Each structure stands twice: as C-alpha cells, then as structure tokens.
C-alpha cells in the first residue's frame, strides 16, 4: 500500500553541503515519525534523526552539531541536510516512518535507500610510528614487531619490510576509516625470538598520492 | 480515570471519523470523550479565575461617631450654625423646636438648631466590577489507563506525567493545543462570551467573604458610600437623630450591619479569593473539540499471553458502568489486554461497550497493576479477561 | 545513540534452529517495544518483527521473536545458506528527547568449516608517538571463523567511550578471518591509569589482553 | 400656664350649664378647657407606665459553637452516627456524599455523613407581655392664674405646691377625683378599654433600647427561640452548613443580628425602662371630664383700684394668644384684676377673649406680681388694664 | 332666695349633752363652708367650727376636745353636738354659710340665732383670800383694801364689811364667769391711810345657795 | 381662732364720721380677704362688708370698709343714735386647717357726756392664797366713759396668752363704768419672773400699773 522513494545527489564533494529528499506516497503525513538511517560499510547501523509533521525534531546527538532536518505538509515531502561532509559519510541512507507508539497496525514502512560518495581530490601524509617487538620475549620461538601508519588519505599505501627481503609472516590488516575522515593501517611481521639482537628490520611505507615515502626502523625496548 | 464517582458526568460519543465535538463543561464536573479508534480522554473545567479587578463603590457598614456638638438659637435670631457644618468630615442636621418663654427666650416661636457629629468608619465592605476582558479559565485534559494503585498520595510531579494537560482559555484567546504525548493533541475551541452574563453582576468583597451580586442592586444599598477609588456620602443612613420630647438631639451610632448584609446576601453565589486573583465557583461553558490531531498509543500492540489476577471485585459505578482492577504476572509486555463482555462463553460474541479504549500494560515487569472501565449490557453478562483456559470469568448483572 | 547488546555471531548447521539474544536496559525495552532488521550489503534495512512477535505481510514463518523484562531474542528455524546476513535488533528509548536506539547487531553465518578461537595481540603506543602529544593502542585479532567480533576496551575496570575505530573483518589467505581495532588516548590519559584491556569477543569464547604504562 | 409654649394645643369650650366634658388627651400634649362661669384648667397625659411584664419567647442573635465533630460510613453500610446526636445541645444535620474507590469505601454510591456542633447562646433578646390588668397612666391638673415663673422646673416636692395635683388612671380604677384646694374638685371618667389596641403589640427588650412591636411579626422572628422563662429551637437560622461541591461540610457561625435587629425595628416606638415599670412615650386616651364640683376661686372680690406696671412686654404665643405679665403697686388686695380688650377708647366696649378666667391677685401687699394669657381679635386692638387715668394701655396687632 | 333656720332645746342641763341643727332652704348645700358660731354675753364673738358638704371639717383648736358636727347631704340639713357643757357655755348659738373662698355673688349668708341656757342645782362653797392692804408707805390720805371671793357656784353671793358698819367708799365689783364654768368677784374699800395702824378691818361673805358664810379679816403687810 | 386686734370703743357726736381700726398679721390678711359684722346683745351678727368693701343689698350708704397689707378699717359717716353697738372684723386664716379668725371687738358709743380716764389698781396674789398652792392677780378699772376697756398683762416684756378671765363693763351710779381683770397663776409662775403688769386701753389713753414679787 505504502510507498517511500529517496531522491538525492547519488555523489557528492567533501566538505560541501549534502542534501536528500523523501517523498510519502500512499498515506498521510502526519501518521509516522519520519526519521533518516544510514549505514556505512564497515560499520553498523546509525539512525540519523527524526522529524514529525508539526516540526518537533530529535536528533542523534552526535550529528546534532552537523545536522537539519524539514518536513512539507503541502507537497507530502520532507528532506535532510547534512553540512560539512567527510569522507567518512559515504554510506547507504534510507528514509522511513517510524511509529513512535505503534500508532499503525501496518508496522513501519520504508524506502529503498541511495548510495552517498564523497569524493574529494584531497591528500594528506601519514604520520608512521614504530610499534616496537614486547621485550621479554619467549626464549626459543616467535616475538612480533610492526609500524603504525596513521591519519593518511586516500588509500591506497605500500609496506614493505627490510626494503622487501622479508616476506615470511607478513600481515597487513586492513585500514580503518575513523570518524575523522583518515585512513590507518598497520602492519606487523612475526620473527624469531633469538634474531632479535643481531638482525634489523625496516619498515618501508610508500603513499602514492602525496608523493611521500616513509622508511622507520623498528628496534627493541 | 478520575470521572469515576462523580455525579454530574456526561458520556459523548462523536461519530466515526468525524472531526467535531462539541461539549459542554460545567464546574465540578467530568466529561468523557469517546470515539470508534479514538482513545477516551476526560475533559474537566476546574477553576474560574479572574484577574485585575478595578473598584466601583466602597460602602461603609460599622462606624462611630464622637465629638458631637449643638448649638442654639432663639426666635427670629435667625438659623444656629456651629464650625463643622463647613466640614464633609462630620453630619449635621437641623430642626425647629418649640420655644417661649419658659424655656428662656423672650417670643414664641419655632427656634432653630443644630446637631453635629464625627462621622469615622471602622469595618468596611468594597464592591468591583468586573471586565470582560479579565477572564481566565483552567480546564484539564487527562486520558484513561495509566496511574495505576501507586498514585493515591501523589501531589508533585504532574509535569512529567504527559497524559495530562493543562489548558487555560481567555476571552483573548479562546483557542489551545495540548501536547498528550502518546496520544497525539487535542485541540479546544471555547466560546467564552457564551458564557454567562457577568455585565450585569459585581464581585463584592466583605471582610473575607466574597459573593457575586446583581449590579442594580448594588446601587441600592442603603448605607454610606463613595465614589471612584475621607469624604463619605449619605451618612444619614448610619446616624439616627433622636428628638426627645422636641427639647434635644442626641445623635446614636447603629449597630453592626453584618447581620443584615448576611441575610440579604442569602441566595447569592459565594465566591473565594487566592491570593490577588480570585476564584469562582459557577458558570458553564460550551466549547467545540478537534479529535482530528488523536491517536491510539499501542494500537498494534499484540495480546498478552499470561493469566490474570482479580485485584479488587469488579463494582458498579453511580452510571452503570463496572471498574475492575487486574494484576497480570507476564513479561512480554507492552501488549493488549484482551478484555471483552461476551453473553455466551463458546462463541464469545463481543458485546457491551470498552470505556478504557484499548486498555494495554506498558510496563514490562511481572506482577503490573492495571485498572479499566467497562460499561456491560442490560442484564446478566459475562466480563471475560484473558486469553486460553488460564482466562478469568466473572458474572454480572444490570439493572 | 545508546547501545544495545548483542553477540557477535550465531552458527549452525543448515536446517538447525538458530537464536540470537539481544540485552538491554529499562530505557529502551521497559516502556516501549522492539523490532528486528535484516541488513543486506548494499540496500537499505529490512523488517522482520515490530511490536516484538508480528511478521509484516510476506515475512516467512520460520522468523519468530520473544520478549522478557529487560532482554528479547530472535529465533529463525531451517537455517538455510540464504539467511547469511547481519540481524539488528532496534527500540525506542526514554532518554533525553527520545533516540532510536540499534544493536552491535549480529552475522549469522552457515558453518562451512568447524569453528576457530580467535588470537589476540596487542601493542602500546610507542615513545616517539608520545612526543608528538598522541597515543594509540594498537589491538590486532586473528585466525578465527566465523567472521565475527565484537572489541571493547576498558580502563582498568570500565568500558571507554570514544577513541576507538574498529575494522571490519577481511578473509584471510586460509578461509579464517582477522580484523583490527585501535585506541586512541592523550598522554595524560595514558600515564594516568595503571593498565588498559583489549576484550575480544566470539560466539562461544572471549580473550583479553592487557597493557599498562609502568 | 404650662400648656403656653406647646404646639399640640387643643382649646374646648364646653356647652354652658353641661357638666360633661369630653377631651382627647394625647401623649406630650396640652389640653385647655374653658367654660362659661368655670375657672380655665390644663388637663395633661404625662407619662404611660405599664408593670408586671410577663415574658413570651426569648430570640438569641449572637451565639457561638465549639466542640465540632462529624462521622462517615461507607455505602450500604447504615446512616452515620455520633455520640452527640442525643444531646439536645447540639444541632445535627445528615446528608448523602458520593464515594468510591477513591474515597476509601468498596462500593459506589450514596454514603451517609452526619454533621454536629455544640450551641451556645452569647447575647439574647427577651419578649414580654403587657397584661392589660397592669396598667397605669399619669395625668396632670393644673389651673392658669397663680404659680409663677419659678416652679417651671420642678420635679420633686410636688405634694407640697397645692396648686398642681396628681392623678393616676388604670383600668383596675378609671375614676378618680383631684382636690384643688380653691376651685373645688375635678372628676375624671375615661375610657381605658378603648384607648388602644394593645393586645396585637407586644413589648420588645433589645441591648437595653426598647421598642413595641406586633404582635404577629414578633411570632416570625427568623431566630433560634425557646418558649417561657436551656432548650433552643431552630438553632439552624443560626447556623449555616456549606457544602463544597457535595463532598465536605463545614460548619460557620453568622454574625451578630444587631444590624437586621435595628434596621427591622425601623418605625417601631422606642421606649424605656425605669426599674421594674416601662415607660412609654406614646399613646392617646379619650377622657371625659365632670366640671359640676368645679368652682371660681375669688369671683366676689372687688376692683382693683390703684395702677399696673408691664412685667414683660406682651408676646404673641404659637395658637395666637398673647401673654402679659403685670406688676401691681396697689395695696388693697387681695382684687379683680380688669382685663379687656377694646376697639374703642371712648366706649371700651369688651372684645376678645379671656383665657385665664377671672384674673385674679391674691397677695395684699405691694408690688405683687402676676401674671394672664389673653386671645385678641384678628387686626388691631388694645389691651386695656386697670380703671380711670393711672390704667395702662399697649396697642396690638393679630393675623 | 337663702334662708337658714335654727332649731333645737332652747334649755339644757350641765352636763349632758347639747345637740342643734341647721336646716338650708332655697340654695345648694355645696356652696359654702357651713358653720356654727355662738356669743357668750359679756364675752366677744367666738367660732366654733367649719364644715363642707363632703366632710371636710376643721374645728376651733380650744374646742377641738369637746365638739362634733355633721352634715347630712340628702335632707339638706347639718347638725352639731356639744358634749359636757359647762354654766359657762350658755351663750346665743347661730348658724351660716361662711365663705372660705367668696365664690358667691351676694356675700355670706346668715341664719337668726338661738338662745340656749345650761341650767344646773350644782353648787361649790367660795375660796376667801384676803386683797392686802395698800403696801408700806402709802401716807398721807387714802388706801384700798379688800377681799377676794374666788371659785363659787351659783349667783347670788353677798359681801358687807364690819358686819355692814362700814358703807363709805364701798366697790363691790360684778362677778367674772371664769371658762371653767364658776363665778368670781372681788370687793375692795377705800379706807384712810392714817387708819390703817389703829382700825382693823373684816371682810364678810355669805353664799345663801351652799349655805357658806366667811369673816375674813384684812391685815397690812 | 386667732384674735384681730381692735381698739376698744370708739366715740363721736351725732353727725360724725367714725372710724374703727382692725390690725390682723400676714396669716390672715395677708392671704384673705375681710369681714364686718355689727353684732346686737342677744341676737344673731348682722352682716356689713364682706370682701372687704361690698354692703350685701339693703345695708345703708354709710357704710364703707378699706383695707391695707396687714391692716383693715370700718368706716360710718353721720354717727346717728341707732348705731350704738358692737362692730367685729372677721377674716379666713390659712393655719394649721383654717380658722375664721373674730376681732376683739370695739363699742360705738354716741357721746352724752365727756370722756373719763380710767383709774387702774393691781393686788398681787396674797400670801395665804400663796400656802394653798395658787396664786391669782386683781386688776380694778374704774371710772371710765366710755364703757370698754382693753385689758392685756404681760410678763416682764411679753404679753401672756391665758389664765386671764374679764368682765364686761357695768354702769355705775354716776352713768360712769366700771370692770375688772384677773390672771391666773401658778406659785412658780409667780416667784420665777421680776415682774407682772396690767395695760388698760382707753379711747384716748393707757395705763401699766407693774407689781413685783420682790
């Protein structure tokens, strides 16, 4: 019976103003707390805010510093507004009407959901820390060392170890989005416990978008 | 739930899906709003408060009188006259008495003479008027089903109870929107000038006692009075000149009216003051009520699927309809209690009529009170509770 | 938003029946209901149960949900290779002005290969990283199945807030998965509290790691 | 020549020879007769004495109550009772409040609540009856001629000046007979029965201020009253239970009465106690007069011979009637006085009246003074006393 | 018009009592003070009493002891009573209107008077006292001396001097009838002075009713 | 009664005008009006003035009455022989009840020789009058014309009211007259005063004779 269709800007800039759009096809407006969900992948479901006809908003309090939101009696719509957006606000969003107090016998009703990329031309240097071995090691077998390669953008970034003569038990984890907008990795390679004193490691990271390359020396203690 | 046990209490019943009601609320008395999908909501006028009230006349019932004088005069010498004669302060009065010449002047004749006294008022009463435009409402709106067994000693904190609302109306503003939370807003259109004729009526304040008088009466009292906002106007009322023998006169102070402004006033409306406003204790009003912004709190709720427990015995209100109170043991809460009047127990044809519209238990721990209306039909009938064969069953009879 | 528990991730066999639990608190479970979601990549949110036991008109019977005070659990028979997706619990809460509050959320993976006990390293944040006025805890998981964990970390004897970004779990080069989490601290932060702990956990096991300043 | 000077004057002339003499002698009133070859007697009602007061009904308008209780049962449950239900002492009143769940009881319906307070009168008025056995009038009889100027005031040791005599009429003895010395004596038959109606009046004791009242309005006293000389009757126009909105009552004394006492009493005679009589100040009384024992005192004395001298210049009294006081040098008293008025000088043919009749000096001693009221004609005229050239002679003028 | 007329014994006995009326013809008995007045020859005028048709009475204060009246309103008559008449009582009785108040154009009114004599056989032997002679020192000439006879009853009594040898310059003067109802008379003679200290001279009384006789003889000093 | 003093006679020539005093006090007079009666020996008083200067109808001209503040007077012009007798004033007094008050009377005598002065001896009571337990006083009058006299005693100053009992006058051979006056006395009476006097009154002359006990 109900019919929800998001309407926006499928892409968007970084650090311009997003702008999405719903319309209610099919009921009234004044029948559901119409509210905003996205979910970035990677992380989990976040609901946005949510607005009822008369104008009484609520919103997550960690967007209220970034966030609007309107509704249109008249033309059956309401939209949202986002300012500032980061490159950590690509995600899936979806309208839909909530029932606050399960005012309908029908349950919730929901849209399809639009796909949001920001994308920017925009760079930055890692920062590349040493993620030293634990000293005090077991005596015979295994010990692990690594770097930290922090507040990059964009991917992709390059490790090697030992300008690449090290290639037993490399492990490279995937980056991590924070909510900054930046990038981070690390990467840590298992060695032997008694090679520890005698041999050196080298951790080579290479950003090809901002033409630096990074080599840091990992040593004990 | 509060129209339970009053006396003066009217049941309406708008049509399906229509937007209007009107209503009337009167003073002391519960009204109760039903509708097909519509929760019932109780409607109460509570108090009449007007504000700024502005003096006519001041009226002077107790008074006394001292320093009085007199002076003399013997035929043909002309009229007596004494220094406070010039003074609005003091009463005076003149005569003609008999003289000759055994009382001591040389001809017979009618001899002037005059009588002075200090007029001093001690207990006063003061009439107001009242304006139109100072008038000032409370109604209250309030919903069935919340405000279980834990509410009997319970003053503070009705602000974070959102079931009620408070709503108060002038002649300024005869409309208002009330927030009822769950159950969306109620909207209430008052026609205050239908209200009652008070351009004919006074509000009339004795020494802590306050009526509301008709206005032409008022101007008929028979005691000293002033003006506007010491000078006092007929103080003959108050001071009785008793001629002895057509020899002397005595001037006498009459006695405390307060007897006689008590029994007069038997039969007017009393009144209360608190404070700078005061409150009235009379009057209806007429007023037209938006059901349009309402809404079921719970509708798809699903049934509650443990037994129930009879708190209190199911009794029979002063208009016929039956308050239970339940305690239900589950957990799955919040959901629908199913409550239905049925007169025969295999088909379970629900009859009667549900007060409580969509009575649900929003707390989800075991062992919730709860409480409904029910009005059953005429005659023997069955209040049903529950669902499967746990259900409780109680046997009922009307008129 | 606030938080609502859940597990990880929930396994069987196919045709085995499969519950997922969901713990919460009074603000949200003991004064309003609470609905069940099906995420699927790429699309928005599906519904399966509102008002806690209805299935909106096409929802297959084998989906059913139960209520207790304070917690509510999901439960799907016939577990098939088709239910592979992630389960989110959601529910209104009384705070500040009102919040729809969602679940860590929950994988339900068809076991194809038998289960794994995840392992667990953890690094503290170097010196020459205290020099430039930051911190980072670096927790790293791996060689575990199904792909599935749930991080918190705690300052001595209580969960932080913020400060932490975890990754989704990649596949590794054997069919396991692995995933990362960082901390992010101040310097006042660090070598002021005697230790911090990494608390990974799985379906059926948990593992924490802790490191202190001194 | 104590009737000069007042307003409510009556001047009768009987018929000549008759012995009968009917006046009407009204309270504060002057009454003087005059007859042919009769001397001229004042006849006055003095004052109105009324003894042996019985009581009627006693009224009580300031009370006070103490020791306020009340009792509440639930519906069905009997009427509420107290203690203080038996005791005539206090006045109780049973009513029907609502109750329910809300107010402590099981059931809805009409609970019973029964209300009593302790009443005690403060300050009372009392009712007394005129018997008409007990009744006593004052009556005056003087005669104009002698008694100068200088028993005008005079109240005490009037069995010693014999030319005033006291006479006093009740309906146990409506005759009496006055010995004036020279002139005889008076008889007086009067009429006690119809004097007036007091059978339909009663005799009201207010705060020591006293008035007479109907008889019938008395009886629709709206006070708490008791019959004879304890147990109060109607204590509830004393008292008044408000009831708020048919939930609670109260109980509140009303103020003193004296204002509706004073202002009812408006028009009603006032009168006053003296000791164990009352004295009235109103009443008239029908009396006939026997003039037959009535005699002039000194018709056979001779002509004054030697001169007069005016006392006081002549002055016109209220009714028109002049009065001239004379001084007489002569010593072959005790003489007539001749008094007349003349038209003309040459003739002096007697016109006019004589009022004092047969003036007459009784002193034989020089210088004696004395003193006649005198009624000339309309216009102009002389009054002429004494005889040949040493007479005096004053021009006056009437209308 | 006005004629008042006695009646009554025109002789009485001493010592009884004496009764007398008074009847009014031709005016009303309310009109004056009604009274009795009598004369005692050789005395002056004397009022007995006053009496008004109602009663009023008022009686000569001497007499107050002694006398009553009456009045009888219907026969127009008034009565008065003498109660223990002495001889001195004997007098000419007479009743009238008296005016206390004139009242009356024509003056009093008077009736005609009767004669009533108390006549009694009593009889009282006389008291002799000798009337000294002139005092010491009346040389040269004349001197009166003689005797008193006091307190007799009846008339006649009989003086003589000397036996009666003695008749110049006799005085024998009449008899005084004293209130309390006895005669009394003295008898002086006129004798020379220079025969006073050789002459004696005796008084001679004889009263023949109470067969009494008495010599005194008069001394000097 | 009281008594009204009168001279004792009053004398004239036939065709004279005579006049007879009458001297009365402020009890009598001074309130009340005066009479005049001309009393015959043996017969009822004759009626003369009354109201002090009316004649009743049929009493001659002659007769006229005046009066003053205590005093009162007879007048009778043209003296004839037919008036020879005894003329009293008579007036009402407001004593104790009232008492009409008689004069004492004064004899009209027409003149038919020249007048005499009495001639007056007093003897005191006797000593052997005095051992009987009386005592009694004589005055002798004699030779007089005409005949009355007014007899008074006094008592040292004063004149005594009773015990004094007198005769009429008497003729004597020689057409002259003659009486007597006695007082009464008591022994204590007698020895207590200094002294005691007899006072005739005659027309035109008084005499006192004084007797002492001393």
Known sequence: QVQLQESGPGLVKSSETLSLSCTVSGASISNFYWSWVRQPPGKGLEWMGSIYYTGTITYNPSLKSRLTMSVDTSKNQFSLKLNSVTAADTAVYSCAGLDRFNWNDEGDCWGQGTLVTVFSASTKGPSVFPLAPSSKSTSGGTAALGCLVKDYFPEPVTVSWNSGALTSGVHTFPAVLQSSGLYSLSSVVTVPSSSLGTQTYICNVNHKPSNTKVDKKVEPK | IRCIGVSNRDFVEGMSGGTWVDVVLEHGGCVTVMAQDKPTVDIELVTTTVSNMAEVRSYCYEASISDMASDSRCPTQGEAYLDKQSDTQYVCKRTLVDRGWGNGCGLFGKGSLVTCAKFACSKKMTGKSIQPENLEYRIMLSVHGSQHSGMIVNDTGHETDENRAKVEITPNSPRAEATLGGFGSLGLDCEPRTGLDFSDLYYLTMNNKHWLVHKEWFHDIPLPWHAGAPHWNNKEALVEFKDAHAKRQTVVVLGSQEGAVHTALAGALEAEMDGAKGRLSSGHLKCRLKMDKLRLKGVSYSLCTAAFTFTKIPAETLHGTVTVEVQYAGTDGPCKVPAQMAVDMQTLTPVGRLITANPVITESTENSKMMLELDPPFGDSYIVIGVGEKKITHHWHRS | ?214
Not at chain 3, 145 to 166: F, L, Q, R
Request: hydrophobic share 30%.
């Open chain 3, 1 to 214: 938003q606030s938080v609502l528990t859940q597990p990880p991730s929930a396994s069987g066999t196919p045709g085995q029946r499969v519950t997922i639990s969901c713990s919460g608190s009074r603000s949200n479970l003991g004064r309003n209901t609470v609905n069940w979601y099906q995420q699927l990549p790429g699309v928005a949110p599906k519904l399966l149960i509102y008002s806690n036991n209805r299935r909106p008109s096409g929802v297959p019977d084998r989906f059913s949900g139960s209520k207790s005070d304070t917690s509510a659990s999901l439960a799907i028979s016939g577990l098939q290779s088709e239910d592979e997706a992630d389960y989110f619990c959601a529910a209104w809460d009384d705070s500040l002005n009102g919040l729809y509050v969602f679940g860590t959320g929950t994988k339900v993976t068809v076991l194809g290969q038998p289960k794994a006990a995840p392992s667990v390293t953890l690094f503290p944040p170097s010196s020459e990283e205290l020099q430039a006025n930051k911190a980072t805890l670096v927790c790293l998981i791996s060689d575990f199945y199904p792909g599935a964990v749930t991080v918190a970390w705690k300052a001595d004897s209580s969960p932080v807030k913020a400060g932490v970004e975890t990754t989704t779990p990649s596949k590794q080069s054997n069919n396991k998965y692995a995933a990362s989490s960082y901390l992010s601290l101040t310097p006042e932060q660090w070598k002021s509290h005697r230790s911090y702990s990494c608390q990974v956990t799985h379906e059926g096991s948990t593992v924490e790691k802790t490191v202190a300043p001194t």
